[PDB]
Design a protein around this ligand. Structure first.
Ligand SMILES: CCCCCCCCOCCOCCOCCOCCO
Ligand SMILES: CCCCCCCCOCCOCCOCCOCCO
Ligand SMILES: CCCCCCCCOCCOCCOCCOCCO
Ligand SMILES: CCCCCCCCOCCOCCOCCOCCO
Ligand SMILES: CCCCCCCCOCCOCCOCCOCCO
Ligand SMILES: CCCCCCCCOCCOCCOCCOCCO
Length: 376
């Protein structure tokens, strides 16, 4: 957040989401690349959730003299996931998942000076996916997926100190000399910071598709190109379209040893004019039959000026640092747990009449349970 999320699995969390289009140790990855369906030879289920605990802080002084300070403006969150994939044939398979690829939340007191650009911003999203895949031969697979997205938005803004700003401007102008001018300033200054200035509530569905190609040099090495379509969501509440952006991703996975694999990816996102990319690299330690270990790093760059930035929507250049571990109870069942630390960069924000600074980070903790059907 983002507002884009990667938290589709706890195993992925532990590898900082690196080459997620090319690994297939559990069912979570089919949501990332429907072509991976052909790596599964038996019905496979997975479920869990990621707990996100952000710490995002705003600082600054308004030209009115009011503090623009705001501690801890991003609340914690639970992001659940469920996945299922199952072969139909030696060539065909299918899968289904419930995920969220998008969400954000910021809240300021309704008494905050910068209220007109920072009150309450709440977007929750749920992706429903059905996928199919076709294996052409030993090397090549293709996957196609259909997405139903449910989105719940809540916005409120407030006057903040706007009326104090207007009072300032009026008093400064020649009109500050007149009696009508003073009165008009006083009327503006007298507007409560907590005056509700805006309010939106909406819940809507949108639809999209996604596709993927898998190339396997052999059972230890593979590469993938994936594409997620944009999804548009028209809230008839009150325009008013919310645009979930395209994503392209290239992934690679190298099992360079019975005990070691690496996995990396480049992912690209453009929207609207303003794009972003993410690179990620990680390694997996297949210690033994019971224990697997997991570590990764990532970096995301969306170079957005500063007068295009929002305090209500934090989007900085960020780093991920992750470790994880999978314990398998047997050849059928396992549990993943992931941890990640997410670090933003202190950034300047010039929005409306205000100048802020913003710095954020987050701790992530995830657990998934995996189960494959038809012993063993
Ligand atoms: C688990 C997520 O899968 C739900 C399947 O979504 C149902 C869509 O219905 C088929 C197309 O209409
Ligand atoms: C200092 O921070 C306070 C920011 O709010 C500015 C307005 O002060 C209250 C006015 O409305 C009541
Ligand atoms: C590349 C072709 C696949 C693209 C189609 C996308 C939607 C496919 O979803 C179909 C899922 O339906 C599940 C069928 O249930 C299995 C029935 O047969 C199982 C026998 O083993
Ligand atoms: C009977 C005359 C009494 C004068 C009261 C007029 C209204 C006083 O409120 C003024 C509020 O303006 C705040 C000043 O803002 C800081 C100055 O710099 C801001 C430039 O706009
Ligand atoms: C548009 C192609 C971009 C390729 C990037 C990833 C390729 C990784 O595989 C390279 C090694 O594979 C050996 C080549 O295999 C023989 C020809 O088939 C390769 C087509 O991908
Ligand atoms: C918006 O349309 C932009 C079209 O260009 C898309 C090309 O993306 C190439 C980046 O992909 C490299 C790794 O994903």
């Amino acid at each position: 957040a983002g507002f884009q999320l990667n938290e589709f699995s706890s195993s992925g969390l532990g590898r900082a989401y690196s080459g997620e289009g090319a690994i297939a140790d559990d069912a979570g990855n089919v949501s990332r690349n429907p072509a991976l369906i052909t790596m599964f030879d038996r019905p496979t289920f997975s479920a869990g959730a990621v707990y996100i605990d952000p710490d995002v802080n705003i600082s600054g002084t308004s030209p009115s003299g009011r503090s623009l300070k705001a501690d801890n403006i991003a609340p914690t969150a639970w992001v659940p996931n469920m996945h299922f994939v199952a072969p139909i044939n030696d060539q065909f398979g299918w899968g289904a998942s419930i995920t969220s690829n998008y969400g954000l939340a910021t809240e300021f007191n309704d008494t905050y000076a910068g209220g007109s650009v920072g009150g309450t911003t709440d977007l929750e999203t749920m992706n429903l996916n059905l996928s199919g895949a076709y294996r052409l031969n030993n090397a090549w697979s293709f996957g196609l997926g259909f997405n139903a997205v449910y989105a719940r938005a809540k916005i409120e803004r407030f006057a903040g100190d706007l009326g104090q700003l207007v009072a300032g401007q009026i008093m400064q102008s020649p009109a500050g000399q007149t009696q009508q001018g003073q009165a008009l300033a006083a009327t503006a200054n007298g507007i409560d910071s907590n005056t509700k200035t805006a309010h939106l509530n909406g819940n809507q569905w949108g639809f999209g598709w996604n596709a993927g190609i898998l190339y396997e040099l052999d059972k230890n090495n593979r590469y993938a190109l994936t594409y997620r379509s944009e999804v548009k969501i028209d809230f008839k509440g009150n325009y008013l379209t919310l645009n979930l952006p395209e994503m392209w991703e290239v992934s690679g996975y190298n099992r360079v040893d019975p005990q070691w694999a690496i996995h990396y990816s480049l992912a690209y996102t453009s929207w609207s004019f303003k794009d972003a990319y993410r690179i990620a690299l990680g390694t997996t330690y297949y210690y033994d039959d019971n224990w697997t270990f997991r570590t990764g790093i990532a970096f995301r760059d969306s170079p957005v000026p500063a007068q295009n930035r929002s305090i209500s929507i934090p989007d900085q250049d960020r780093f991920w640092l992750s470790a994880g571990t999978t314990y398998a109870f047997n050849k059928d069942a396992s549990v993943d747990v992931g941890v990640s630390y997410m670090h933003g960069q202190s950034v300047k924000i010039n929005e409306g009449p205000y100048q802020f600074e913003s710095e954020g980070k987050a701790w992530l903790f995830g657990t998934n349970f995996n189960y494959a059907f038809h012993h063993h």
